Write a structure and sequence with these properties.
Chain A: One of its GO terms (molecular function) is quinone binding. The structure is cut from a larger assembly and holds chains A (162 residues), B (54 residues), C (475 residues), D (131 residues) and E (100 residues). Chain B has 54 residues and is mostly helical. Chain B has helices at residues 6-25, 33-53. Chain B has two helices and no strands. Chain C has one domain (1-475). In chain E, 78% of the residues lie in helices and 0% in strands. In chain E, helix 2 packs antiparallel against helix 3 (57-87). Classes of the chains: A mainly alpha (162), B mainly alpha (54), C mainly alpha (475), D mainly alpha (131), E mainly alpha (100). Chains in contact: A-B, A-C, A-D, A-E, B-C, B-E, C-D, C-E, D-E. At the A-E interface, helix 1, helix 2, helix 3, helix 5 and helix 6 of A face helix 1, helix 2 and helix 3 of E. The structure holds 1,2-Distearoyl-sn-glycerophosphoethanolamine and eicosane (LFA). 1,2-Distearoyl-sn-glycerophosphoethanolamine binds at residues 46, 49-50, 52-53, 56-57, 59, 71, 74-75, 78-79, 82, 328, 463-464, 467, 470-471 of chain C.
Chain lengths: 162, 54, 475, 131, 100
Amino acid sequence: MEFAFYICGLIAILATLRVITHTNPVHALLYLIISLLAISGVFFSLGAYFAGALEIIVYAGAIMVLFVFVVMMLNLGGSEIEQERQWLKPQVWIGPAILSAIMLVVIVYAILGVNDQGIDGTPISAKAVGITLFGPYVLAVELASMLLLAGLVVAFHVGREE
Amino acid sequence: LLKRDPLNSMMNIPAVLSRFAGKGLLLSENGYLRWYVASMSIGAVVVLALLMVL
Amino acid sequence: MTITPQNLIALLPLLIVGLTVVVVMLSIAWRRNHFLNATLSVIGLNAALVSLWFVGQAGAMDVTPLMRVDGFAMLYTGLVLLASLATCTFAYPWLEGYNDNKDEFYLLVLIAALGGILLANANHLASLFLGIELISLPLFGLVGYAFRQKRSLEASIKYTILSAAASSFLLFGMALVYAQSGDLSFVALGKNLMLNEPLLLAGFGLMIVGLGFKLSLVPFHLWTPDVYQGAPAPVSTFLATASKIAIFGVVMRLFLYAPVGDSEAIRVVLAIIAFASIIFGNLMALSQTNIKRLLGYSSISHLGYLLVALIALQTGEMSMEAVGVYLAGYLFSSLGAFGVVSLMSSPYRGPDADSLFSYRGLFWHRPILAAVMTVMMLSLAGIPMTLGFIGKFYVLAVGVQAHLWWLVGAVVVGSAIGLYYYLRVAVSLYLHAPPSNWQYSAGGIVVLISALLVLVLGVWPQPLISIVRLAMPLM
Amino acid sequence: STEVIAHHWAFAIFLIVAIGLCCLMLVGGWFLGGRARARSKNVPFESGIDSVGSARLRLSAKFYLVAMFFVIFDVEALYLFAWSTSIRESGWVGFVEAAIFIFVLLAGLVYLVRIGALDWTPARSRRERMN
Amino acid sequence: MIPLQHGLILAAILFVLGLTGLVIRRNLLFMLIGLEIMINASALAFVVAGSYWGQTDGQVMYILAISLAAAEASIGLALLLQLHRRRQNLNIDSVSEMRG
Ligand SMILES: CCCCCCCCCCCCCCCCCC(=O)OC[C@H](COP(=O)(O)OCCN)OC(=O)CCCCCCCCCCCCCCCCC
Ligand SMILES: CCCCCCCCCCCCCCCCCCCC
């Protein structure tokens, strides 16, 4: 359980770091797939089985759409790789590097002072999540339907041709 | 000596400081989205550090 | 707990706005009819506005762990419904010149109004998060509705990327708060505490990052003039009024109910943000030749004044009614100003009339719009005989009662800077410069009614005081 | 217990042996047999004549709108996945909630179909002219 | 016996990595990818917090989080399409003509 958690978290961290500092967009999407699979393994190690299943299920479809858009626009051989590699310089990354590092330092310092009894990893079932979702969280479900409707309408209005 | 009204200029000093500070602050609105994200991250760092020290 | 029929009665504006979303969308699917779909949207918004009376007759109670309906929720639901109705009224003569499909505008406005109502009733971290996104995403569509233009597409991309970043910040802060507390309800954020737990404070800081982005508070404010200028003018009206009002209302409710609202570190951080917001927003608007960017920096300063009223929430007892009176006055003044901008930009012809040279000499062809705009410039300046002064007076009284002398001095200094640029606009209206439809006349009637309300409630504010004092939440 | 850890070990060995068998067959295919040499062997196959350009191009798909809609509809599907495993516990009130959710879903689908958002066929392929 | 602090630290690391990717990348597609990493890290933090307390609310907040992520990715892809159609490039520094 902790074996799976630590190895999946390490794989997720390394794959995300590979994603944000990569030049090829298809390779970046593959590392994003690997990172999201690893985060799903982290979810499975914590007993959140439904969340891990949904993490693999809906991001496999979502990154497929990203691949569709990458094939539509970005992939050109070495032209987009040369253009993207020229966009990345030592100064351009070293600027926000300490900013992210000190944000992580402050957040980690705040984390380390909290009371922690440990996560026992007892599985919280999909049935319990469904009971809570359609119980105390009814308005969350209906207004989330309205939110996805708004996303549909915005995507239709913007992403058209003529 | 006084025909320029020196006290009026001394009291016009805060208006000049206001123009200068406003023109300096307008430099931050360069129009770049990545700078806006960076400024949000900077403000997050500042807010979190201020909450940690107090 | 379940949903009682009484809970359904308290859910009435949410139910009516959702039902009219579905009805308007099905009517669009049947046939594109700009007049009919605009009429159905405004009929649904008016039906929610008049169902507020039945919600008031029901009483104040909890609907699920997520929502709580009281007089405060009634007041902010009414504010966002008025803002949405005015936005639709301004949108019709603007959309009459739009060559592409116009019916989706009202759908997005209705879904954003639904998010505003949810934020009015929000009692939960889930409700607050969902209401924020339910406001933000239709505004991604609305800000980039005229995506064939440079500026609207730029503002859409900026608002979308930065609001996704702010949502991620707010969600991570919510997760840290939940990890500390174990409950997502507002009242339990600090019940188990000694109130300055580092993880609770860091979570509330990241939530402050997201919420201060949404409220254009310094230093999360740089998007505001860009998105205000780029967006269509009725979209700028909605984004300036309804989003700011709903998000500040849920921020007030969260800081009133959560035990960590009384923490000194959060109060000091909010005081720094309010001071910088007032001063910076007034200073940056000094040299603005664009009316939309000027109103964006103005919104930054006015949200700073509201933040000053929020800082003294735990100390005094006048802070919440101060925020109510201020938000009513700011809603009416912003409706008038942005509506004059919209009516001068109607019908849509590409780039809107947002330069100050366009409004220079407005009195010699549009005298009524010039009078409304100068009344709004006087009101946003906080000049007596206007409702904006009554709001500024409430903010000053609340700040003096809590001994927030730095914020009081900031309000005075920012008011003087505001006097400069607001009076510049108001007198440029009367210098010398080198429609014919009932919906345009309805927009003109809306800005004229806002101007008359601002004048009358600046002279005679007591009915607004009584209404806002009636709109009291559950202690 | 013991059956649970036995099934965990069985799942682990299943995955390991499956991936190892795939790798072993790939290695055996790679190393066995001879190799061909030709002047145009390392040219992509395009029916025997040289390409005009290459496969690295901005090839515009026509179903990209349907791809956005697919992402949205998959998230709606997971909401229904959560509901369907606990229907008896949620009762008729949960049924009313899911009926409203599904009706909003279907109204959005009807809206997308009716506005032509789901249509990307070219006009000469719409098969209008028939006997 | 996984500590709650370890899961929160992992989520924070993924969050700051996604934020760094959002800042340092000029391509709008990589910015959208960094935004996806950010929201997924926040959802992971909610899952960790829900698992520590033994509550379904962590996974419920996760579900709402990925619903927002899906709709946001949809809108961002539509806007990226418009940027590519009207600029022939995905450089986010090019869309900066509003300033001051
Ligand atoms: C062409 C078609 C046009 C259609 C009409 C459009 C314009 C008119 C809109 C009408 C809206 C009516 C809203 C009525 C709200 C109040 C209803 C009511 O009866 O409230 C009473 C209630 C306290 O009284 P009681 O019911 O006895 O409660 C005891 C315990 N529950 O009170 C409360 O609990 C609090 C009530 C106050 C809440 C705020 C008021 C509602 C929102 C107003 C927003 C605008 C305010 C600023 C403008 C003021 C102008 C003077
Ligand atoms: C062409 C426009 C490009 C804009 C790129 C913006 C990059 C901003 C990088 C900021 C890095 C800050 C590093 C830390 C500074 C010290 C802490 C914050 C200030 C007190």
